[PDB]
Design a protein around this ligand. Structure first.
Ligand SMILES: Cc1cn([C@H]2CC[C@@H](COP(=O)(O)OP(=O)(O)OP(=O)(O)O)O2)c(=O)[nH]c1=O
Ligand code: NA
Ligand code: NA
Ligand code: NA
Ligand code: NA
Length: 326
DNA sequence: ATGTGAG
DNA sequence: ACTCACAT
């Protein structure tokens, strides 16, 4: 969050390459944690060996910083930005279902764009094919006026099915965001607690129903606990049609509701801060259970929770309500 | 079982 | 950080 942006920019882009184009995940981590250290740094960096004093920045990662701070930018990130392969892997990556490995494989075979893909759906698995089919609007985001409209359609249909069901919309929404990427529903039913076995049925029935009233149109994956698929708000009579959205429905044990609604309402970075900044206090927060991390690596028997706050006050952390979670 | 993808 | 689902 400091006036060291440029430095951490090129650092982040340099990893988004080792991820997408190179083999390396460890190079991807090293470059990212380096971005992290420099971001929190109080001062403005004017040397390469000054950033090096930090843990995570080291010889080759600090040589490059000298370049950035000596001559404009970096040569490596120019050969990359001006490569056909790299740019195309990065493009393909943008369909859900495709990431690094498959893009590599596709670009190796001269497949590089939407038109390229549509003529080549044979190569894609089912997930990817729906990501394709709905590429345009999957990158579009969702207004609230329209977001609520779906909530009043999931809350209303899930209750008509069986009034014991509880649906709480999470992610961005709970954080108050004016715009969301994709719909996130945590589902809870009394019949299902942590001690009880499975009940895929409890999920699959609100799914199968949401399909019947034609609000869910596709499925990416559907299991015991989790459904990932595609929704779309009702075409208010012909043509002016709303775009297709992504939607998750997770089925949470009723007794571990609080832990679960914590895990959702992100961000994913807030979940990684809070989780890491717990393992110093020797705890292992889940989406299910907070629990002491004993002597060796043995994770002790859970921990009572009747509110998020309790998780918060377990790990000796200030409380931050859903809207300050990032 | 593992790798991959999404979360 | 830590899980879940898919496809070998
Ligand atoms: C990706 C990811 C997510 N989570 C949790 C935390 C949030 C929920 C849903 O997050 P989402 O990606 O939709 O974020 P959302 O807030 O909905 O952002 P958009 O509005 O979709 O952009 O998942 C996580 O723990 N680790 C992860 O790596
Ligand atoms: Na993708
Ligand atoms: Na979301
Ligand atoms: Na999601
Ligand atoms: Na943790």
């Amino acid at each position: 969050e400091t006036l060291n942006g440029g430095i951490t920019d090129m650092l982040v882009e340099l990893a988004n390459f080792e991820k997408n184009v190179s083999q390396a995940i460890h190079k991807y981590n090293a470059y990212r944690k380096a971005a992290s250290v420099i971001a929190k740094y109080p001062h403005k960096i004017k040397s390469g060996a000054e950033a090096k004093k930090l843990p995570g920045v080291g010889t080759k990662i600090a040589e490059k910083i000298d370049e950035f701070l000596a001559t404009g930018k970096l040569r490596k990130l120019e050969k990359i930005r001006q490569d056909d392969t790299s740019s195309s892997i990065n493009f393909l990556t943008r369909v859900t279902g495709i990431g690094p490995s498959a893009a590599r494989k596709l670009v190796d075979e001269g497949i590089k764009t939407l038109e390229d893909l549509r003529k080549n759906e044979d190569k894609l698995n089912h997930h990817q094919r729906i990501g394709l089919k709905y590429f345009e609007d999957f990158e579009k985001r969702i207004p609230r006026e329209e977001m609520l409209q779906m909530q009043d359609i999931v809350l209303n249909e899930v209750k008509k099915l069986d009034p014991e069901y509880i649906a709480t919309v999470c992610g961005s929404f709970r954080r108050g965001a004016e715009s969301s990427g994709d719909m996130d529903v945590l589902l809870t039913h009394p019949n299902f607690t942590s001690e009880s076995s499975k009940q895929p049925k409890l999920l699959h029935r609100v799914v199968e129903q949401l399909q019947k009233v034609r609000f869910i149109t596709d499925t990416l994956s559907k299991g015991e606990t989790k459904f990932m698929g595609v929704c779309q708000l009702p075409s208010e009579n012909d043509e002016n049609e709303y775009p297709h959205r992504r939607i998750d429905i997770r089925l949470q044990p009723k007794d571990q509701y609080y832990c679960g609604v914590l895990y959702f309402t992100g961000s994913d970075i807030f979940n990684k801060n809070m989780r890491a900044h717990a393992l110093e206090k020797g705890f292992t927060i889940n989406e299910y259970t907070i629990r002491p991390l004993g002597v060796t690596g043995v994770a002790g028997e859970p921990l009572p929770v009747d509110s998020e706050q309790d998780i918060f006050d377990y790990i000796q952390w200030r409380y931050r309500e859903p809207k300050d979670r990032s």
